[PDB]
Design a protein around this ligand. Sequence first.
Ligand SMILES: [Hg+2]
Ligand SMILES: [Hg+2]
Lengths: 187, 187
Amino acid sequence: TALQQAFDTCQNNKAAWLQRKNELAAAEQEYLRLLSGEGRNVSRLDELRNIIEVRKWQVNQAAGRYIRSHEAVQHISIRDRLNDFMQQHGTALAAALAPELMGYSELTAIARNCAIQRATDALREALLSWLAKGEKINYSAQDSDILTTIGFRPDVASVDDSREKFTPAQNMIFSRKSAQLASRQSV
Amino acid sequence: TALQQAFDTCQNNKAAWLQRKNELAAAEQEYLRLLSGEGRNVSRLDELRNIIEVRKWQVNQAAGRYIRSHEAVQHISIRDRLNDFMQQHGTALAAALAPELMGYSELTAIARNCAIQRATDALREALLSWLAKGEKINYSAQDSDILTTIGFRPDVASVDDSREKFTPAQNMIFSRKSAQLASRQSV
Ligand SMILES: [Hg+2]
Ligand SMILES: [Hg+2]
């Protein structure tokens, strides 16, 4: 399913994000070791300084991509579970909304928009009243394992990491440097 | 119930509106009979001209009041039937919306607004997809007799009748003249 793929991608993206944070930390650590020593490796320091800049960008990109993949999983589940819900109870729901919705398949564009907006306001009010009961809400059983596994929201750390904005021109430079970093043989 | 009262009021208001339209027509008819005759009852004509102006205002007011009472019946039924719906299926609906709604009773004001808006967008999308099936929508069985009796929408005649706007100052004058018209003994 699309949901399963979306979950595999989210899990992959979260790992990539944490991997980048590890790599950055490893570079920061080597840099600091050199700053703390007696030597003065001008070129190694300069190269590490460049690497650190690249890793920060990678952390930022990975964090954003992870957040979007996380939201994608939830978005797909909601859509799909709501479709199943309407399959079971659409008739009763529409019937309750009949004074707004009856004759929908015959309405003009302008009429359909009004009808949907008003039906939507009524639904919102009903949802709000039900929510006020304070009943605890669990995930749909069908998607509970996946939704539980991914967590309710991405950690704020990923939001902090992706806050910085990079232009397309910057992404061009950094994506080039990333590829260069990826083909480096350590020696 | 509030719905039963609202229906009694709608039925009353529709009758009042048609009654006013009859009264106006009766005055217009007497006026025309006089215009078509040989006589020249200056004062009766002038009084009829005044009466006709008052009846037009009454038709306008009654029409508006009828439309609002009709919408009130539908508004109450939708609210009530949706409440019953949530009573039966709220848990499943909320569960399907869990990635948006879970933890709602704990959210800040800003968070609650976002959560409701997003849950509401998802609902709208689900409703739209279900509607695209083109299944015919009937009234909830509980309110079907009342909703059928009142009709889906007020006749456009009532919209035409209430289109004209009257200021509070005009309503003051006309409401006075209406009362005067009501205490007239015909002679
Ligand atoms: Hg994930
Ligand atoms: Hg009515």
